[PDB]
Protein: Myeloid differentiation primary response protein MyD88
Amino acid sequence: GGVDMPERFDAFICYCPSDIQFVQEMIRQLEQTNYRLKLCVSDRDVLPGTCVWSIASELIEKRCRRMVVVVSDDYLQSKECDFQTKFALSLSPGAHQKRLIPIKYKAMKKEFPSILRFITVCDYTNPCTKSWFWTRLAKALSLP
Ligand SMILES: [Mg+2]
Structure:
């Protein structure tokens, strides 16, 4: 009986503490789609009421198919961004679009991270794509 703890994950969610409220909203919404996503973060304890799992940093590239990147002005200054930027720069040609899913959720005064310049963004601020935003993100994350 019961629920298993995953060995491999659909995605790691990379975010700085300033953006935790967005991540809390995202996880609940993704859990309310017709998918059973396997999601991980550095510390599940700060995301109560969710099905997310904790993962050691050194295991992320090996065990996560993709990385969701929550981008904001605050994020650009964070150690979490340092980790994600190094991760992105470690990737071979073609791997960036296959493994990175950047999300914007509020206005930014700063330019988007250099390494994400050719990467498709999930823009939560655009009302024109809002109705199916979470469903489409969940489908994207569920794919190999
Ligand atoms: Mg909207």
Remarks:
- Residues 16 and 75 are 6 Å apart (CA to CA).
